[PDB]
C-alpha cells in the first residue's frame, strides 16, 4: 500500500458520467461529474489531482481510458506512471442516493457524498494525510 | 496560523474568472477557472474543498462574495464559519504567464501553475499535510 498509488474509474448515474479517483492505501476519494467520458476530461482531472496530492502511479479497471494522446501528455507533464502492481464506487453510489433529494444537481450530490465518505469514521481523510506525512518523515 | 483557515478570492485573466483558495498556514493553493463570478460557482467550490481538506473557517478580501443564500447553505451544510481573526494571487499569475504557451486553454495553464506552486521548494504541499497530521496527533 504505497502512498503514491491512485485508482481512476468512470461510473454512470442518471445518464451522466462520474469520474472516481481512490487513494488505494487510505480509501480517500476524489470524484466529479464530467460532461463526457473523453481523454480531455480524464487529462484535466489527473493534472488537477497531481497538483493537490503526490500522485506517482495510476491504475484503472478500464485500460483503454489511458490510450488517448491527451492523457499520456498529462501523465508525461505531471511525471505520473501507470501502476503494474495491482466496490467504493458502490459505497459512494449508496451515499449519493441517501443525499440525492437534498440537491437539485447530481454534481452537488456527488461532492456531498465525497464529503461524507472522506469524513466518516480514523477517517479516510485523516489516513491519507497521516500516510503521506509519514512518508515525508 | 490555525490548520483550518482558508482564504478565497477571485482574480481575472484573459477575460475569465479564476477562483483561488489559499491554506493560510501553509501557502498551499487550490484554484480553478469558473465561467462566472456567481454564488453557485463559489458554493460548489467550497463543498468540493471541504470534502478534501478540513475547512473550519474561510476569509476573503471581498466580503460581498459570502452574501448569496447559496454560499451560506454550502457553508451551513459543510459546517464552515466565516473567519474574523484576519500576493500569491500574483505569484500564481507569474507562474501562469511562464506556462501559458504550453497550453491552449487557460484552465489547463492554471492547474499547471497550481502544480508548480504546490510542489516547489519543504513544499507548500508537504507543509499542509504536516500541519494537518500534526493537528490530528
Ligand atoms: C439555498 C439555495 C441553494 C442551496 C443549494 C446549495 C447546496 C449546498 C449543499 C447542500 C445543498 C444545497 C442546495 C443550491 C441552491 C440553489 C440552487 C442550486 C442549483 C443549489 C445546488 O447547486 C449548486 C451547489 C449551487 C451548484 C443544488 O444542486 O441544489
Ligand atoms: C497531446 C495533445 C494535448 C495535450 C494537452 C494536454 C495537456 C496536459 C498538460 C500539459 C499541456 C497539455 C496539452 C492538450 C492536448 C490536446 C488538446 C487540448 C485541449 C489540450 C489541453 O486541454 C486539456 C488538458 C485537454 C483540457 C490544453 O489546454 O492544451
Ligand 1 center–CA A5 separation, angstroms: 33
- The per-residue DSSP string of chain A comes to --TTEEEEEEEEETTEEEEEEEETTTTEEEEEEESS--HHHHHHHHHHHHTTS---EEEES-GGGG-SHHHHHHHHHHT-EE-----HHHHHHHHHHHHGGG-SSHHHHHHHHHHHHHH----HHHHHHHHHHHHH-
CA–CA separation, A63 vs A59, rounded Å?
A: 8
Kindly provide the resolution of this structure in angstroms, with one decimal: 2.2
Listed in sequence order, the residues at least 6 apart from A123 whose beta carbon sits closer than 8 Å to its beta carbon are none
Q: How many residues does chain A have?
A: 137
Please state which architecture CATH assigns to domain A2-136: 2-Layer Sandwich (3.30)
CA–CA separation, A6 vs A29, rounded Å?
A: 9
Where exactly are the structural domains of chain B? 2-136
User: Measured at the alpha carbon of residue B67, what is the angle toward residues B65 and B69, in degrees to the nearest 5?
Assistant: 120
Quick check: helix, strand or coil at residue B29?
A: strand
CA–CA separation, A43 vs A75, rounded Å?
A: 8
Write out chain A residues lying below 8 Å of B108, CB-based.
44, 47
| Method for this entry | X-ray
CA–CA separation, B124 vs B119, rounded Å?
A: 7
Contact between residue A40 and residue B108 where contact means Cβ atoms under 8 Å apart: no
Shortest-distance Cα residue to atom 15 of ligand 1: B70
Residues with CB under 6 A from ligand 2: A 40, 43-44, 47, 69-70, 73-74, 77; B 102-105, 108
Amino acid at each position: 500500500c504505497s502512498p503514491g498509488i491512485w485508482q481512476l474509474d468512470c461510473t454512470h448515474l442518471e445518464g451522466k458520467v462520474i469520474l472516481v479517483a481512490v487513494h488505494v492505501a487510505s480509501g480517500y476519494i476524489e470524484a466529479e461529474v464530467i460532461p463526457a467520458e473523453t481523454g480531455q476530461e480524464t487529462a484535466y482531472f489527473l493534472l488537477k489531482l497531481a497538483g493537490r496530492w503526490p500522485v506517482k502511479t495510476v491504475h484503472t479497471d478500464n485500460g483503454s481510458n489511458f490510450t488517448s494522446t491527451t492523457v499520456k501528455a498529462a501523465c508525461w507533464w505531471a511525471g505520473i506512471k501507470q501502476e503494474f502492481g495491482i466496490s467504493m464506487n458502490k459505497e459512494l453510489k449508496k451515499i449519493i442516493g441517501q443525499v440525492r433529494d437534498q440537491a437539485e444537481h447530481l454534481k452537488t450530490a456527488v461532492q456531498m457524498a465525497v464529503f461524507i465518505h472522506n469524513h466518516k469514521r480514523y477517517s479516510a481523510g485523516e489516513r491519507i494525510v497521516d500516510i503521506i506525512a509519514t512518508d515525508i518523515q
